[PDB]
Amino acid sequence: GSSGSSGPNYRWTQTLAELDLAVPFRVSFRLKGKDVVVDIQRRHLRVGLKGQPPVVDGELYNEVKVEESSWLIEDGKVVTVHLEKINKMEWWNRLVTSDPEINTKKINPENSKLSDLDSETRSMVSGPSSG
Template sequence: MNIDDEKFDGLLLAIAEKHENGIPQFLDTIASFLRRKTDFFTGVSQAEWEGLLLGVFQKQYEKAITQNSGNGNQSVTKQDNRKAENIAKRESRDEENAPKEEISKPINDVDDESEKEEIGKLKPNSGNGCTLDNYSWTQTLQEVEVKIPLKTSSTLRARDIDVIIGKSSIKVGLKNQEAVINGKLCAEVKQEDSVWVLQDNNIVLITLEKINKMNWWDRLISTDPPISTRKINPEPSKLSDLDGETRSLVEKMMYDQRQKEMGLPTSEDKRKIEILEKFKMQHPEMDFSNCKFN
């Protein structure tokens, strides 16, 4: 082991001990420090800081594998495996007993002037969607997942459920009863790739395949209260699953959407401005005071 590896062990252990939720909270503290005190996230592209993080952790992973294989202590490995299995079982029980996700709450406080328009909109739930009284939904850039618990004491079968998925509409409920969801979708979906299943005898789970995979939905149907798409936190691993060209396009679209929501120039607007500035430098004799972009 490199002596430098142990240089900050005392400090890091002291910090780690203050985190009741273990490694995830510890890593979140480090990421928070980088966000608040450095330009780690904003000074480079998302692809660059993701690549840097992946490279660092991959390097340490390979060292861990090499060290473990060199020890030749199989009993330790088995013991660790048993611990991991017990932790997984415990976490599974905790998840089952955990309280249901709270209903999405309106945004009342904002950090700066540019976010005033967000007041009154709902905060996205942990799945970048919304949790309402009768159903909840989550989303990625590719699809929307809707979860509808049907309030009945009866054991339901698929034939008892009425689900109609249109290109731009959806209707869900028990047959011969008022629908739980019935309205125009936020955006169009691929009917042939959208499916539903009955889960645990009383929960309808629907997966809607988006046609436009570049935008976040701010609501499921037109009558729902909107969520703040500026508060959406896309999972980096989802973007990393895309090929290079598609990922670059998605990142550009996400950037442009955020810029539009904040009333700032998009990447295309910036490109036009740069061209104009260059042209102005080449032709100082011309008057560009009335020049506007469409």
């Protein structure tokens, strides 16, 4: 990261061992481990929200122990992924060898509004049988 032109989309790092990925989302609820999308592959990290576009999608810089992978939802919105190197002794110069697609907009999206709204919800849905 940090080149001059264009910017990233999601935050990520590492520690000459394990990797760390984070993808914030503009939601109004606490995303659960169901409406999320995390395809931690050996040499490919695909992240995103179910139904939504995968913020991450490309061949990792190198194989990574997927079996020892993990991910969670921070602030019930941000999707964090935990990648593990196979050697755990190599510095990566890039998250993926081939970027996904878009790179979203600049860091800050837009904070030119004034918190002043109101709207909730409440209801149920049962699933009957047939035959």
